[PDB]
């Protein structure tokens, strides 16, 4: 086990790191797992849209905005990269066109370089979050494994 | 495109008009603002939106203070009588052109966006609102740096006109007026932004408003900061945020925010702010502060 | 224009269409015999016997621009089709798209390269007759085949 250090952790609104939340003050005890703190936050990578879990629209987060990536240059390589990322099997299709529906918020990816074997979608080379003429009826789409 | 922006004309007993821009300053820009009600003059130029018609007339201004209430106040203007032969019209963008604001959030510098079109307040789409056009916005109302940008209604939905302008901010604007914009929703789509100055910190219980106890608000409560970590860096920075030059000395619930200021940030919220785990702080034990109460002065290294 | 690449003749291996100064292969989605039966046409090759994909002539290099056919077969143009762009690619070349038609032609011997001579014709494989086959004749199967420059006619075992 890990003993606990914080308790009481009231985060407001505006600070985007856990050190500008005022809680009550460090101090070191034995905590049991029921007063533990166990988070299952949904990852930047998601789809939308889908009649599989692993298919649909590709979407990102970044700079609090759910963005949709453009399908400039989207290939089988972007689309490999997209279902490792979401934890699933390699990737079956890399739509364009908008298959699954237009997607909401900005376009913050579009001509994705991605060689097939990147862990996750921001490493591969590209312009990233922002400056895209990309409309949402060019909005990417991704259908990997069940 | 707007009321504040585009070449200048003017109309004397019913005539077509403009001024010639022989020594077209920023002073007189910025007098034509003020007496036009749109702030102050950024630039003498616009984004050309419409066409005026020509005329053979021309307005010259020998030379205006800059203090002038109105154009009409400058000594020696003279109507007519010349030819504006080797220059152009006086082009001027003034701020209001595109003035912003964030509305409908807790805290300071968060909010809905809603830039106005000279006199009309507006929201704007979460798709035609970039990161560049974002840290602009932040900029301007001086908010320090953008922290995030909220889409789909985050600050709740603002009755009005939604712009179907598309800002192509490049990131370094000073404004949104200087911003090239594109102009072509739903208010569900409503665009906010997370600048970051939430610090909302004040003085309080002072016989001077450039001096009292130090009180900040977190949480939607204002508390009495005190000075466990409050060291003279961080006073420093408190009286230059609120426009009181520099500190001289430091004497609801207790906030037991640590300021890590080097002393030479403009606001708390640039300050690196550490809050978490932060150990208790007697009740007699509070941080306060005395500003210099001169803005001219300034901090030395 | 058009051509098969990597079929083993003229009248099978993956489809080509050449525009734009390149030579392109098509998606393979959707692709059906019926719309195999215009390229056979296309060429003359007669109707198409398979229509086979999924870099089964092997892998394309080449930009796609061609996917989504829908060919009816009456056609008698590869591009009158209900293509789905010209450039509209959404796929890899380990998807081509290739076809084998009527007239696709092969041949084999069976018994290595000794043995009965087999040719393939309208997707049937069949024996050559032995009447007027010259030493000529046989040196054309040998080298075809790639085993010899010469032969010599065996009688059957
Ligand atoms: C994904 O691909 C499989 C086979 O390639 C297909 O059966 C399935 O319908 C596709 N999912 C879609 C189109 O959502
Ligand atoms: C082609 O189709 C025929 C039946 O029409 C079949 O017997 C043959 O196996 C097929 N060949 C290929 C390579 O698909
Ligand atoms: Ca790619
Ligand atoms: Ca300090
Ligand atoms: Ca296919
Ligand atoms: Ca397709
Ligand atoms: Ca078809």
């Not at chain 1, 079956?92 to 918020?105: D, H, I, P, Y």
């Amino acid at each position: 086990s890990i003993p606990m250090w914080v308790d009481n952790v009231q985060c407001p609104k505006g600070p985007d790191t856990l050190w500008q939340c005022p809680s009550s003050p460090w101090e070191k005890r034995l905590a049991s797992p029921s007063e533990e703190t166990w988070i299952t936050c949904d990852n930047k990578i998601r789809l939308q849209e889908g009649p599989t879990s692993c298919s649909g629209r590709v979407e990102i987060w970044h700079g609090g905005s759910w963005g949709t990536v453009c399908d400039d240059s989207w290939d089988l390589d972007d689309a490999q990269v997209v279902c490792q990322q979401l934890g699933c099997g390699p990737a079956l299709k890399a739509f364009k066109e908008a298959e699954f529906g237009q997607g909401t918020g900005p376009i913050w990816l579009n001509e994705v370089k991605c060689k097939g074997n990147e862990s996750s979608l921001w490493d591969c080379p590209a312009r990233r979050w922002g400056h895209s003429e990309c409309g949402h009826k060019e909005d990417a789409a991704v259908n990997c494994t069940d | 495109g707007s009321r504040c922006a585009g070449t200048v004309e003017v109309e004397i007993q019913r005539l077509l008009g403009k001024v010639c821009d022989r020594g077209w300053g920023l002073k007189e820009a910025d007098v034509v603002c003020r007496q036009l009600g749109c702030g102050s003059a950024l630039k003498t130029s616009y984004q050309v939106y419409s066409k005026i018609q020509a005329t053979n007339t021309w307005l010259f201004l020998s030379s205006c203070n800059g203090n002038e209430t109105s154009l009409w106040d400058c000594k020696n203007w003279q109507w007519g009588g010349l030819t504006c032969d080797h220059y152009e019209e006086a082009k001027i963008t003034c701020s209001a052109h595109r003035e912003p604001r964030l509305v409908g959030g807790d805290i300071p510098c968060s909010g809905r966006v809603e830039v106005k079109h000279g006199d009309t307040w507006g929201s704007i789409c979460d798709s035609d609102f970039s990161l560049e056009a974002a840290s602009v916005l932040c900029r301007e109302l001086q908010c320090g740096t953008v922290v995030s940008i909220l889409g789909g209604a985050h600050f709740g939905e603002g009755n009005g006109q939604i712009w179907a302008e598309e800002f192509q901010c490049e990131g370094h604007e000073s404004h949104l007026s200087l911003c090239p914009v594109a102009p072509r929703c739903s208010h569900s789509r409503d665009v906010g932004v997370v600048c970051s100055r939430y610090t909302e910190i004040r003085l309080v219980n002072g016989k001077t408003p450039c001096e009292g106890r130090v009180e900040l608000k977190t949480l939607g409560a204002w508390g009495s900061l005190c000075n466990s970590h409050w060291d003279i860096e961080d006073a420093h920075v408190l009286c230059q945020q609120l426009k009181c030059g520099v500190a001289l000395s430091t004497p609801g619930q207790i906030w037991r925010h640590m300021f890590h200021c080097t002393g030479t940030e403009q606001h708390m919220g640039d300050c690196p702010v550490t809050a978490l785990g932060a150990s208790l702080c007697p009740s007699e034990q509070v941080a306060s502060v005395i500003c210099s109460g001169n803005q001219s002065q300034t901090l030395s290294s | 224009q058009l051509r098969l690449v990597n079929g083993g003749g003229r009248c099978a291996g993956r489809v080509e269409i050449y525009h734009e100064g390149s030579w392109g292969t098509i998606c393979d989605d959707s692709w059906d015999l019926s719309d195999a039966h215009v390229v056979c046409r296309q060429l003359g090759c007669g109707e198409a016997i398979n229509a086979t994909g999924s870099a089964h002539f092997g892998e394309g290099t080449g930009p796609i621009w061609l996917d989504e056919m829908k060919c009816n077969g009456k056609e008698s143009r590869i591009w009158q089709c209900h293509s789905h762009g010209w450039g509209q690619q959404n796929c890899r070349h380990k998807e081509d798209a290739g076809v084998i038609c009527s007239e696709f032609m092969s041949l084999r011997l069976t018994s290595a390269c000794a043995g009965r001579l087999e040719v393939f014709y309208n997707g049937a494989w069949g024996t050559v007759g032995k009447s007027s086959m010259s030493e000529t004749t046989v040196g054309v199967v040998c080298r075809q085949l790639g085993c010899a420059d010469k032969g010599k006619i065996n009688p059957a075992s």
